[PDB]
Design a protein around this ligand. Structure first.
Ligand SMILES: NC(=O)c1ccc[n+]([C@@H]2O[C@H](COP(=O)([O-])OP(=O)(O)OC[C@H]3O[C@@H](n4cnc5c(N)ncnc54)[C@H](O)[C@@H]3O)[C@@H](O)[C@H]2O)c1
Ligand SMILES: NC(=O)c1ccc[n+]([C@@H]2O[C@H](COP(=O)([O-])OP(=O)(O)OC[C@H]3O[C@@H](n4cnc5c(N)ncnc54)[C@H](O)[C@@H]3O)[C@@H](O)[C@H]2O)c1
Ligand SMILES: CC(=O)N[C@H]1[C@@H](OP(=O)(O)OP(=O)(O)OC[C@H]2O[C@@H](n3ccc(=O)[nH]c3=O)[C@H](O)[C@@H]2O)O[C@H](CO)[C@@H](O)[C@@H]1O
Ligand SMILES: CC(=O)N[C@H]1[C@@H](OP(=O)(O)OP(=O)(O)OC[C@H]2O[C@@H](n3ccc(=O)[nH]c3=O)[C@H](O)[C@@H]2O)O[C@H](CO)[C@@H](O)[C@@H]1O
Ligand code: NA
Ligand code: NA
Ligand code: NA
Ligand code: NA
Lengths: 338, 338
């Protein structure tokens, strides 16, 4: 199929594009380069074993979206474009709402005009908010997320849902996931945070490489087996894979298809650290701090539905996530070249 | 003060503008005329006893907003502009999200750029959704509204709230209300629905004037005193007044100020009908139908907080709401002239 991949040069999108191309689809990448570099492109093509057309531009530009859609005769859209830094969302809520809420709205408005009706939304499990019972199941009502980031994601899920109700011929997947980690096995693609890394893994990696001194561990008194927070980490390759299957299998199948993408288990902060020490051949430095801001003791997603329905499940381990991360870090210490 | 009144030529805004001008503020009206006519303008000026500057344009046009803001040195913005037809929201969700969510976002983005930090949001009590205990109190968490209309309102409330958190010097009022009815006492301004009227009152009025045959009453078996739905109706003049006080009193007072605007009591469908029969001098025709779509038995707002805090409370009766409505209908059967 002809797939427009918004945010394709980013972390998860870049990995998703390689997999798309490997499956032989025709890939059109749309990215504004606000959080990714052109230098990834060629790696994409190479590992993908095929050429992905690249378009520099913004989802908020509805006109341009429509153009692209028509110009390329798109069948489906996988939408990764957006902003995803939680604390930054609290400081700059407007930007988050503009990029995510209006950004997606502009994007689907254009699809409508261009008559594109297949969509894969890269959601977030933050949507469950404090509406648990854990692990989270797609049948659980969402709760109220705490940052503007979380809220923007649920808002978009809601909009898409209503849209689908009004235009029942649309196929929309809401892919909810938690913590994407790792990197392509080649070691030539991986997560390239620009500043202080958001996620645990990269933060750890930077400590490990000497860029950081010690990992602050927030709260060593949670009601967990080791006292640290328990989260759900998913290898970015498994995630990429989820995206492709979801895209291939749901195209032209009307409805709102909600699926948690995860390993179906949680790992504590120490488990991740220890996995990483083992990966990089040396003890990661860390210390304990008091319980953080918007953090809970433990949560992870129930991924039974995608297994049953898409026949998808993760295949990589936490140890590989660590290794693959160390591998990329170690091969391209400076990340993507300018 | 210098107030930009978005959606000022509409129903509630037009009444609010008259009151503003009477208080002697400098009024700038911004409206796209999608649901109002220029013909209201002169009536505004007249009843207002002053000249309101009019700008034809859209809230979604951020550039234009910023321009206006600067050009007029605005102190505060009262925001009524948007779409508000519930069933239409289900059919055309995108338009509702664009106009309301993106429309407000564009508007406040512009304020930011123009350094305007006083805002009065014309909210809706639909935000409480099914998160009751009734009557609703500002201290009650909101629930999940059922139409895209309701959801768009809560989304906007959320955005503003986060914005205020990030930019603490902003003063933002979230004015929640239910059913605005009635018309200016002059009989020269009132609600002018274009097609099949949304609200009970006008629908009734049209039946009364002969434009409609019979009022369908949805559900005569609710757990209410008379078996029909109990709602909260508020004379548009009292609402206008609420808006002015809120605007005068909260300017430069940082925070998110939430206030229910209502009479603090409910009236059933039959109570409204009977009030109207009495107003128009003849029995309104109606029949019963089965319980409607997104309708509950009874709800109204608790308006204690605005009384205590703004020293505001309604002063008009249901009977006046009916009379004032009949008065306008009767003086301008064709509504606003083209
Ligand atoms: N990485 C995570 O921890 C996390 C977890 C949940 C959800 N997600 C979601 O996945 C998507 C991106 O995730 P990621 O980790 O690959 O981030 P990323 O920043 O690496 O990828 C996002 C890409 O989108 C681009 N982009 C941002 N705003 C844009 C706009 N308006 N127009 C065009 N391109 C724009 C950026 O330049 C970047 O290449 C978002 O939908 C995000 O909410 C990621
Ligand atoms: N009337 C009600 O029953 C109801 C109850 C709750 C909330 N409200 C709110 O009050 C506001 C309007 O209420 P109303 O009853 O006066 O409706 P109305 O349609 O009479 O007034 C809205 C005005 O906004 C204008 N408008 C719409 N989209 C615009 C845009 N993008 N740019 C500029 N102008 C635009 C219309 O032309 C119209 O004059 C909205 O915020 C609505 O959600 C009304
Ligand atoms: C804080 C954060 O980024 N929130 C993200 C994440 O939360 P999430 O908490 O799941 O992920 P994090 O990477 O932020 O932290 C994982 C765990 O490690 C801890 N930790 C993390 C970093 C660090 O430097 N030190 C430390 O102790 C936290 O207590 C937590 O218990 O879920 C979403 C997935 O849909 C992301 O899009 C959010 O952007
Ligand atoms: C249906 C509807 O417009 N929803 C509106 C309203 O709901 P709300 O139900 O409060 O107001 P309505 O005018 O729609 O109806 C009031 C009552 O009369 C009944 N009724 C109404 C019309 C009619 O033709 N026949 C009839 O029986 C309904 O059962 C209800 O019990 O609250 C919001 C106020 O914040 C508005 O912005 C919503 O747009
Ligand atoms: Na429909
Ligand atoms: Na770099
Ligand atoms: Na801040
Ligand atoms: Na008319």
């Amino acid at each position: 199929m002809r797939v427009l991949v918004t945010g394709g040069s980013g972390y998860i999108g870049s990995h998703t594009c390689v997999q798309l191309l490997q499956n032989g689809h025709d890939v059109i990448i749309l990215d504004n380069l606000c959080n990714s570099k052109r230098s990834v492109l060629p790696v994409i093509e190479r590992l993908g074993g095929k050429h992905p057309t690249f378009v520099e531009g913004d989802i908020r530009n509805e006109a341009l979206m429509t153009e692209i859609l028509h110009d390329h005769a798109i069948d489906t859209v996988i939408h990764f474009a957006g902003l995803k830094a939680v604390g930054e969302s609290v400081q700059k809520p407007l930007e988050y709402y503009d990029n995510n809420v209006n950004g997606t709205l502009r994007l689907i408005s254009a699809m409508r005009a261009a008559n594109v009706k297949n969509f894969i939304f890269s959601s977030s499990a933050t949507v469950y908010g404090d509406n648990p019972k854990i692990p989270y199941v797609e049948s659980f009502p969402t709760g109220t997320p705490q940052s503007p980031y979380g809220k923007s994601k649920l808002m978009v899920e809601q909009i898409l849902t209503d849209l689908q109700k009004a235009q029942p011929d649309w196929s929309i997947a809401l892919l909810r996931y938690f913590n994407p980690v790792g990197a392509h096995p080649s070691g030539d693609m991986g997560e390239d945070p620009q500043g202080i890394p958001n996620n645990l893994m990269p933060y750890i990696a930077q400590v490990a490489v000497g860029r950081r001194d010690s990992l602050a561990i927030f709260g060593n008194d949670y009601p967990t087996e080791d006292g640290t927070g328990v989260r759900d980490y998913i290898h970015v390759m498994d995630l990429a894979d989820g995206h492709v299957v979801a895209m291939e299998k749901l195209a032209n199948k009307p409805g709102v298809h909600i699926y948690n993408l995860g390993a179906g288990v949680g790992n504590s902060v120490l488990d991740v650290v220890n996995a990483f020490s083992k990966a990089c051949g040396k003890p990661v430095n860390y210390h304990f701090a008091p319980r953080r801001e918007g953090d809970l003791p433990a949560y992870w997603a129930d991924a039974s539905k995608a297994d049953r329905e898409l026949n998808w499940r993760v295949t990589r381990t936490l140890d590989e996530m660590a290794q693959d991360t160390w591998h990329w870090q170690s091969r391209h210490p400076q990340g993507y070249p300018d």
